[PDB]
Amino acid sequence: VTVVYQNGLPVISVRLPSRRERCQFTLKPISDSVGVFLRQLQEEDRGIDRVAIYSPDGVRVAASTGIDLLLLDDFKLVINDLTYHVRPPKNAATLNDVKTLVQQLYTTLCIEQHQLNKERELIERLEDLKEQLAPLEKVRIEISRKAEKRTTLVLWGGLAYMATQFGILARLTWWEYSWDIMEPVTYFITYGSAMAMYAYFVMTRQEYVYPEARDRQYLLFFHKGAKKSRFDLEKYNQLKDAIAQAEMDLKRLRD
């Protein structure tokens, strides 16, 4: 017969004697035991003569052993005559476990003072890096601003465009030309954007949205701006990790 505890619970569809009834048997892993399981079995049919469960050695298993402990290994379930060799699918305290415990003790004696040393060490490594970082940060502040201006004067240069278009399509619609000979060329514009807007997404895999597409140009304006000025970036951010990595630890050490 079968065995399935994959849906969370063992189910044992078994074929009863003188019956095609491959009847399912759901059963909890531990809160149930072979006793009431067999009670659940012998109540619904007349396979009564041998409601028994033999360990592979033929040893009749206990009447109240753990269901899980049963299906933890192969055995030979049996009915009045026949057996169903079931291969189901896949704690004692030991000296090896006890050593872990002696460690947890020792670390509980040392961690009392060891932290006070790490703290009074972490601050300094933090402090040493803070002074190690200050000159880097100083230049970083400026180059970012040199990129800040360079990009915050593209947004307006992006806006004033949208004016000088809306300013170049007024004259070409009311003053000079028609609206029947302009409406077309002002539709391809709207379809020029709504396609060039897309083509930008192919160019960066970063969907064109004003917040993002600003920053993805801010960074470019920063690195290119920083890479020129010879100001390091890797070592700077490298420190910024540690000066945060060393930080979170000290925050984590408020015990």
Partner: protein, 51 residues
């Protein structure tokens, strides 16, 4: 989105300094040149072109 997960209230979101003018005084003078660039263009086309 308006309150932190801890229940606190978010900080005062920033409004740039009189930026309404900063944009209002940057749309119009470039809305006005869009006129001018067209006008001289609208004349250049009669020198050698359409309508």
């Amino acid at each position: 989105v308006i309150v932190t997960r801890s229940g606190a209230i978010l900080p005062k979101p920033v409004k740039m300094s009189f930026g309404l003018l900063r944009v209002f005084s940057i749309v119009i003078p470039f809305l006005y040149v869009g006129t001018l660039i067209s006008k001289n263009f609208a004349a250049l086309l009669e020198e050698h072109d359409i309508f």
